[model samples]
Target chain A: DENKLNVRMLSDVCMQSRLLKEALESKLPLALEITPFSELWLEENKPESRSIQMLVIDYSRISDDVLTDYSSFKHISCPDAKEVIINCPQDIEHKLLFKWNNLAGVFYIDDDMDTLIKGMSKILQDEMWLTRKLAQEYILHYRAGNSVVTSQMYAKLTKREQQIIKLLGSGASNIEIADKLFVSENTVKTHLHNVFKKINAKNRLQALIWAKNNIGI
Target chain B: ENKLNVRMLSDVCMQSRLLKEALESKLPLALEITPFSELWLEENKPESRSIQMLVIDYSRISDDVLTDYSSFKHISCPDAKEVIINCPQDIEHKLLFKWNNLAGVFYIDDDMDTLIKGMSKILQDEMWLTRKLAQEYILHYRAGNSVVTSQMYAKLTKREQQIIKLLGSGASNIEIADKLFVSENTVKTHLHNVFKKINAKNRLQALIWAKNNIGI
Candidate 1:
């Protein structure tokens, strides 16, 4: 199949809806269709609907009821579609949007038509259109490391002592881990040996595996 | 009299020496190493209060101080630009939330080169942030203060908004006229209206304002 942009609107805003359909089709090589908010559930597995490249769901339509079963519709019904929420509240938490998978982006009610149309084209290109803050939260999320500590014997260790295990659990070598903690390699070794005895682990391998099962690093 | 008294707070002697060694080698900083508990007690003194920057040991800070966001103002160096060192790789973003001035964050995996470079920048009154993190801060800043931007924005006519968007996208006067299907004189008039409405003195200033306020 020749690659083409397919867009679906799940709202009944009438005048604005038609204007967008007119604008998008006129300007881009795309297909636009309206599947009223109530009819989304009826279109699943219908061969044509599954090819949808972008699904723009109106926040106002879904905020009340459709969201009650959002994951089912977004994930299961239109698995291939990159869903975007349009007319979202200005103050909507980006974290909330990030919690779901396959969200293409968010568009605010305050957005001009040009922004929406530009965003729609951008979505087709697999580029995310989000506020920079949301993008930063995502950067922080990917940069974060997994937790590596315990409930019992872990409490007995100093935080400085515990961090050796934290870095070790993240699979860092002693020399680099020392550099990270601003300590000597000997200090790193000493702490590792201490934690090894406390956790009853024989060596680095034992400690790392121990961390995986118990500490989740 | 002009230089800031920078301090490193850590419970471990071994770790403090290493960081102090690295920072002192890279920058002319008189960094005194102190324990978190000691600072918690002494931070009320004017001498302690006047310390300008803190290099915090992420692991060694007291639980009593870390748990409460409010008591940090009283217990921690109150006016310092803080850089969290030895941060467990996962908790980077969470730590930036508490302090008055979060200057930087260093993960347990960050190398000596990363640390010294970060310290050098912090000394120059520049924050140590990745390019993405800097952009995030800019967007976060704009989101909070956008009532003013939006107010100025709402005053723009639709034609004015289009003209500004085209200008910011680097459209020429003829290009703007061509896109909007208006004459070159009409394009210049609309551009003038955008400048007047948005309080920009010239095209470049209007362009700068447009880049900040307008988004995809």
Candidate 2:
């Protein structure tokens, strides 16, 4: 089958909360998302703005719905009206157009394909990234080891920059900063330079304070 | 006897374009400027939303007076509009603000008398958690290697902790290592350890992966 295989384990968080763990775990390719991924797309092949969608359904009946809905539709909307609605099969046809769709696009596969199909139809709707940059923020926090900022929050520091920012906030000097790591002063300076630019900070202290409030200290 | 100290350095990129460098050779507490430093603010924190007033001036004294005037206005607009006219005696007290009025600024210190004053200004900004400390740490990190993440950065306990905190808050190897009470060498070892675990080619990639991905 040429179907995009979305192999999702029993995501405990998904099972535990309304938000599926796969959705939480899954990340959009950076090239696609300019804020995170450095790569920029030429105007032509660009995708639509990212969005979030959810599939709402009765937990107990979800299994049955997945089984019936699996083969019929490539994507499905969430049972809850909270997220965007998507039809599964349409997604596989046009991947770029469906960029905004999240949970609907994801096909939960299990050994017994019947179960997923059953829940597929049962899921009423799903959540999409309707300007909820929270996921981006969540990924940033997750990567840096800080859970303070969620997906929707715009971090003062980029996730990568946060690591360097912490060092600066602690009152570490450049030589001391260089000796602590592997890169040369040039690279560290680049990151610091970016931090200074990003936060409009004059020095380490200012950047840290700005980062603390926007993301957290 | 407080006066803002200013220094300028020229940076030539691939082309003949000359750029100002903020905090080049000077120590972190020892203030200076670099081209990299200037661009960052323009891109990330200019005018909109994150409106912060910076005191550092872009020393690009172009022949076109009109162009320079626009940039000057843009740089010191909104909150702290006091321009860097010169290092006047009451400049620090009059031109700058401790909290909301002034976000932060950069300057140069030639001698102990001036250095002490510069340090005082830097420290005053600390109450808002805005000091040269972060820049110092950043410059320091940039000096050694591009390895800035725990997954691929210094694998030592302190490095690991440093990344973890960056995952949350801003702290440094000195602070992290000191808290762990291990030598800087141990911290370096841990960063190397991170490189292996994350399977990053080097520190920069390691930091990149760590920043982009979550958990592992």
Candidate 3:
């Protein structure tokens, strides 16, 4: 069965930290696959290796020596492996380029647990669309200064419009945003239009991208 | 003189737990008054027996003992004794209704640092206005269900509200659940509801929304 999956952590320090505790307790995977600094996954868990499904590698502080040897186990693990990378607010720049496109790979970065889980709910549906939404939120937050997005330049927006920007950043659809706010979908769109005018973005992705570059979401 | 002022805490927990280090280190006055569990300030300071200057007492807790004996202290003390009662968020509804109009009640329950610094800031007109802005900003946050106003403000039942406040300082749902004493799935559910209410799509958004809407 695929039930006995192992979560491969880098070391005791990274594994025992509050950040990793948040990651482990946050996800649904059963147990972790512990390894020495530079050892391979198959080298450590060699016997019943076929039972291993996913490898959750900590990209944060794991040594370059470990990452360099990651490809050695890539063949047996790569076909079925889903690398769940943990990222900080500062490492967002590198995350933009992570693509499973031609590599035929599967990996997920744990950004903020709540948002990532919300994206996981989205993952239950269309994968690419949800990923883009999350990406946009990350960018929006990064651009807005990470404190929280405040529009001093455009304070004329109703509380509703300001609220909409936050919802949009959270990956809610216009219809979903409308249902949440008790407004019509058109009203949601109207709010977005005003927000786009102020924030200078043409669409949701643009707004989110602009927010990443400019606004602190 | 600076010597007449006495620092009395209504919530010893608030002082000891919340601002324990700062209170111990920052204040110039002595904490000579008996420490209180609740807002009961012991009106009789040791210095009040000998000399009489304007006894400006900064009381951050609201206890019946302080108010009941307010007029007696005023009449007995030769110095102008004015007890500035700072308000905490956990005030009972009936007590608040009764005392909202009462004079000598300057309610503020933030922290000793904020209260004392605010008093110092009052010396400068510009700094005083800045504190007023913060006070107004706090009022705006309180009205929106954005801040945990008092220990009493914990009346909000949404697990999401608690979760969001936990997330406000940027804690993950896993960390949030541990603090809130719930499951990750349960935390997720609360976060889902919070996002809907605040119209945010992610944790950062939820946190940002909570900071703006729920004053934590």
Count of clashing residue pairs in every prediction: 1, 103, 21
Put down candidate 2 lDDT per residue, B1-216, tens digits, no spaces. 132332222222211011111122232322223232343244323332232223333232222222222233334333432223112222333113211233333332122234234434554553221245345444654666332222223444545745544532333556556767878577657757765665544444444344433222
Candidate 2 docking band: incorrect
Model 1 residue-pair collision total: 1
Each model's DockQ score: 0.01, 0.01, 0.01
Candidate 1, A1-217: lDDT as tens digits: 2455778888653323454555568766788787766666567547777677778777755643343234345544566677788778888865556534567788885576568668877877789988888778776765685232243555567888788877776778899899999999998898888887566654576666545434433
Q: What is the C-alpha lDDT profile of model 2 across A1-217, one tens digit per residue? A: 1222222221111111211222222332111111101111111122222121222222121222232122112122122212222222222322222222233323311111233333343433233322234345445545777533211122445765666665665667666666677667777778888766635554554455434433434
Question: What CAPRI class is candidate 1?
Answer: incorrect
Which candidate number has the best TM-score? 1
Stretches > 4 Å off in candidate 2:
A1-160, A212-217, B1-216
Model 1: residue B64 alpha-carbon error in angstroms: 52
Candidate 1 chain A weakest ten by summed lDDT: A63-72
Instruction: Compose the digit string of candidate 3's lDDT tens values, residues B1-216.
Output: 453344333322211222323333454433333333322133445554433222123342333233323332343343432333434334443233222112232344333435456434432222322344345544654666333333322444665556766776778778988887888898888777655545444555455444433444
TM-score of each: 0.33, 0.16, 0.25
Best by lDDT: 1
Model 2: fnat (fraction of native contacts): 0.00
